[PDB]
């Protein structure tokens, strides 16, 4: 019922996960040739990473779209594709860039 005869294994035997902090290297880019490489925290869904990205540049609700592992994803799945610690990636498809005009 155990990996070895001993029920407990030494901490050194298991490398474990090395984490520089609660921030990952998450970078999201948009079809408009926009590149965003920076680190965010992954303690909650990926909403915090893209939400700051969406309001500071453009909320996907009307123009931006977020592709994560490869398919359009939501902002409420941590264990799913948000289990990354220092390498997360998202691609966004934007249709409008906004403008100071009334439009």
Task: Give a concise summary.
With 103 residues, the chain is an alpha+beta fold. The protein has one helix and four strands. Pfam families: Rad60-SLD.
CATH topology: Ubiquitin-like (UB roll)
Order of helices and strands: EEHEE
Instruction: Give the CATH H-level superfamily.
Output: Phosphatidylinositol 3-kinase Catalytic Subunit, Chain A, domain 1
Largest sheet: 4 strands, mixed
Distance between the termini: 67 Å
Assign an overall shape.
elongated
Cross-link (Glycyl lysine isopeptide (Gly-Lys) (interchain with K-? in acceptor proteins)): 99
Protein name: Small ubiquitin-related modifier 1
Cross-link (Glycyl lysine isopeptide (Lys-Gly) (interchain with G-Cter in SUMO1)): 9, 27
Main location: nucleus
Key features of this structure:
ubiquitin protein ligase binding; 1 helix; alpha+beta; transcription factor binding; 103 residues; ubiquitin-like protein ligase binding; cell membrane; monomer; elongated
Report on this structure.
- The chain has a single domain, classed as Roll (Ubiquitin-like (UB roll)), CATH 3.10.20.90.
- 17% of the residues are buried.
- β1 and β2 form a beta hairpin.
- The protein has 103 residues and is α+β, with helices and mostly antiparallel strands.
- The protein is elongated.
- The longest helix has 11 residues, at 47-57.
- Strands 2-1-4-3 form a four-stranded mixed beta sheet, with helices on one face.
- The chain has one helix and four strands, in the order ββαββ.
- The chain starts with 22 loop residues before the first strand and ends in a 9-residue tail after the last strand.
- The PDB classes it as targeting protein.
- The entry lists the keywords sumo-1, post-translational protein modification, ubiquitin-like proteins, targeting protein.
- The assembly is monomeric.
């Amino acid at each position: 019922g155990s990996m070895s005869d001993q029920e407990a294994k030494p901490s050194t035997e298991d490398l474990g996960d090395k984490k520089e902090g609660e921030y990952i290297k998450l970078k999201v880019i948009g079809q408009d040739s926009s590149e965003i490489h920076f680190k965010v925290k992954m303690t909650t869904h990926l909403k915090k990473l893209k939400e700051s990205y969406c309001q500071r540049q453009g909320v996907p609700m009307n123009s931006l779209r977020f592709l994560f592992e490869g398919q359009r994803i939501a902002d409420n799945h941590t264990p799913k594709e948000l289990g990354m610690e220092e390498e997360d990636v998202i691609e966004v498809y934007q249709e409008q860039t906004g403008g100071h005009s009334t439009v």
